[PDB]
Amino acid sequence: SLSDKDKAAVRALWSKIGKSADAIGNDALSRMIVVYPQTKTYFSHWPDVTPGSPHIKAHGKKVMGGIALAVSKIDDLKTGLMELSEQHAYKLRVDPANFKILNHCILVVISTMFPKEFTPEAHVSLDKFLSGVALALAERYR
Amino acid sequence: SLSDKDKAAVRALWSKIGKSADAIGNDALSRMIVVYPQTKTYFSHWPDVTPGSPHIKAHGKKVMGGIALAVSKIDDLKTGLMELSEQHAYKLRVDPANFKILNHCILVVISTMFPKEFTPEAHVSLDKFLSGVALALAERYR
Amino acid sequence: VEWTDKERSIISDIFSHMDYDDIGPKALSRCLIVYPWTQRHFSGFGNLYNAEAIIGNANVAAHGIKVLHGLDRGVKNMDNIAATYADLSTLHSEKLHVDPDNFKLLSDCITIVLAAKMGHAFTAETQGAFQKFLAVVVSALGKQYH
Amino acid sequence: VEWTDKERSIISDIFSHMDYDDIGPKALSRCLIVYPWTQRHFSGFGNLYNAEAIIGNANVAAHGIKVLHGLDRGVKNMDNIAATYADLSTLHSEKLHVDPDNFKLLSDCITIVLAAKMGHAFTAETQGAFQKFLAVVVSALGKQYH
Numbered sequence A, B: 001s002l003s004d005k006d007k008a009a010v011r012a013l014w015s016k017i018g019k020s021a022d023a024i025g026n027d028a029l030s031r032m033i034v035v036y037p038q039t040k041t042y043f044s045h046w047p048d049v050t051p052g053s054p055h056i057k058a059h060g061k062k063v064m065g066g067i068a069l070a071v072s073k074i075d076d077l078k079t080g081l082m083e084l085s086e087q088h089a090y091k092l093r094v095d096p097a098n099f100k101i102l103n104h105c106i107l108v109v110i111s112t113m114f115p116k117e118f119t120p121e122a123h124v125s126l127d128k129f130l131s132g133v134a135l136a137l138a139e140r141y142r
Numbered sequence C, D: 001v002e003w004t005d006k007e008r009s010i011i012s013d014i015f016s017h018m019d020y021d022d023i024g025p026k027a028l029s030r031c032l033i034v035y036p037w038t039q040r041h042f043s044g045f046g047n048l049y050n051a052e053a054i055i056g057n058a059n060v061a062a063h064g065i066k067v068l069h070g071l072d073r074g075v076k077n078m079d080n081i082a083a084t085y086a087d088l089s090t091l092h093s094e095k096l097h098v099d100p101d102n103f104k105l106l107s108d109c110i111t112i113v114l115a116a117k118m119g120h121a122f123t124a125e126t127q128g129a130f131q132k133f134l135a136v137v138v139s140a141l142g143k144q145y146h
């Protein structure tokens, strides 16, 4: 679970990097699809899933908006992300094993873009936060 | 997270199998040590860690008493298992990756001993419960 | 894995005493109930409405039996498992889009169903050899890097 | 893994441009802070009191550098990785009692530290080849069944 120290670290990091949420998402989704090819099937209904695709870029904005929502709902991720859980579980049927893969890609992207801000202390709290986001997104699965 | 349906299923299963908690623990710890040899190091201070050991049998009672405590604290595992978390994290320094291994061994033992009671519906709720126990035991780790 | 003669004997004994028609349907139905997201690969199987429906579904039974017979080729040649499952791997991946994590979930359900059947004969040593064999098959199917 | 020439070139390029003295200490200190239970293998390293202490600890730096040089033998012969790390595997297991899960945690910290250093040059394709190489090494060290 997230301590007050963790919540403060995540809010402070997001305060610094949030201006680049759209870029972080486009980059994170792009890497996920290339490095973990099994995830491409979920986006195959889009007319372009190749590197540089405008659909991946547009979707990246939505994904990091979900992370921004999670930061605002950090005190209760289960309630805050319930609708997103239902959508991934029932409408999209995204296998839940993939949440940790996108989380790792988000940490990689943040490291490439904000090396100074993404210190080991920012990383420990963000990692605990992303595990919490994954657990909340897994809510409606079983 | 555990729904009311999950809590009722775990309480009903435990009501049926709890009389054999001691045996389940001895069996679960015995399998863990044999099948996942990396876990033996945590028990090496005991004078006998070989199959059939009286220390493993005695400890098995304690482990399932912790599961019994978790069933009683099912509505708030984090608070209920906080002292056990601190003990595994600080005093024993048990690597947290091992909680899911013991959980799997407990499910195997329950299946061998109570095949009729351990239906797929009992299994889904118990598995969600054991993941919750692992997450609560991981509380004091980072 | 460098198999010991004892591991080979255990695996051979297990498979020769297994009733595939009983174990196969139970393992797959258990996987569909405990990890319900796996039901998405079985849309046209019909009744997948609830636990009772899944457990009695003859299409689910047929597939669970296929899974167990799919392990036979591994049992037959324990030193060539990764090569043996290469085509099955491509099928589940490229054609079926089964998430590689799902093979592990199903293999734990097979182990749990076998444990229920064998009872006290499913000793720690038996469990170790059986899970080790399933781990090798799961690695080949999921195309794990090694 | 059957390496493509492109994967071999990427891995060679990465290691030839890596400053081990910078990347090694950062990766290990990051692992000790993000997954603090791993600090238990470094009792006699001295100052492990808090993040600042860990990051500046010269013993932690020395070990992180050793880890990176430990990857060189894998880079040198990419087709014989599992055999090459067999002795290191026995050391970390039998003598050191390092949990096999810990190799994966450390490898993710190495990837994250390299990403911070390379910045935009750490492309998806670069990340894929690097992680694939670390996955093979992690499998050999942790003695995963395949």
Ligand code: HEM
Pocket: A039, A042, A043, A059, A062, A063, A064, A065, A066, A067, A084, A087, A088, A092, A094, A098, A099, A102, A103, A133, A137
């Ligand atoms: C950090 C975890 C994640 C967050 C916060 C997240 C958030 C979102 C958000 C906000 C939406 C838009 C929902 C809407 O339509 O209103 C969405 C849709 C979607 N997500 Fe996720 N998601 C995550 C992980 C994943 C993963 C791991 C996959 C698949 C591998 C995935 C696949 C999809 C798909 C297929 C859509 C719908 C795309 C479309 O509109 O066609 N998501 N996600």
Ligand code: HEM
Pocket: B039, B042, B043, B059, B062, B063, B064, B065, B066, B067, B084, B087, B088, B092, B094, B098, B099, B102, B103, B133, B137
């Ligand atoms: C289902 C998860 C688990 C439960 C509920 C559990 C519960 C317990 C309990 C109740 C105690 C006794 C605490 C006391 O001294 O008052 C204990 C001690 C201990 N546990 Fe666990 N435990 C779990 C998992 C693990 C795992 C995965 C390992 C190691 C691989 C482990 C290693 C130990 C050790 C080394 C001790 C102390 C033994 C001694 O007294 O010398 N535990 N555990």
Ligand code: HEM
Pocket: C038, C041, C042, C066, C067, C068, C069, C070, C071, C088, C092, C096, C098, C102, C103, C106, C107, C137, C141
């Ligand atoms: C220990 C793991 C498994 C083994 C050895 C295995 C084996 C097989 C075999 C032998 C077949 C028949 C191939 C054919 O018809 O040519 C098959 C097909 C298939 N498998 Fe698996 N399988 C495994 C795991 C899975 C998992 C985890 C899923 C899904 C979550 C899955 C989904 C399917 C589907 C949908 C079919 C296609 C056949 C049809 O729909 O009629 N399998 N598998």
Ligand code: HEM
Pocket: D038, D041, D042, D066, D067, D068, D069, D070, D071, D088, D092, D096, D098, D102, D103, D106, D107, D137, D141
């Ligand atoms: C990518 C993974 C890793 C590689 C390639 C690696 C490499 C090495 C190398 C080359 C040495 C020196 C061997 C010698 O002195 O003969 C070593 C020793 C050691 N390693 Fe690792 N290692 C890795 C991961 C780990 C992990 C995850 C831990 C602990 C969580 C760890 C703990 C140690 C310790 C405690 C020593 C003994 C040396 C001493 O204490 O002075 N290593 N490792």
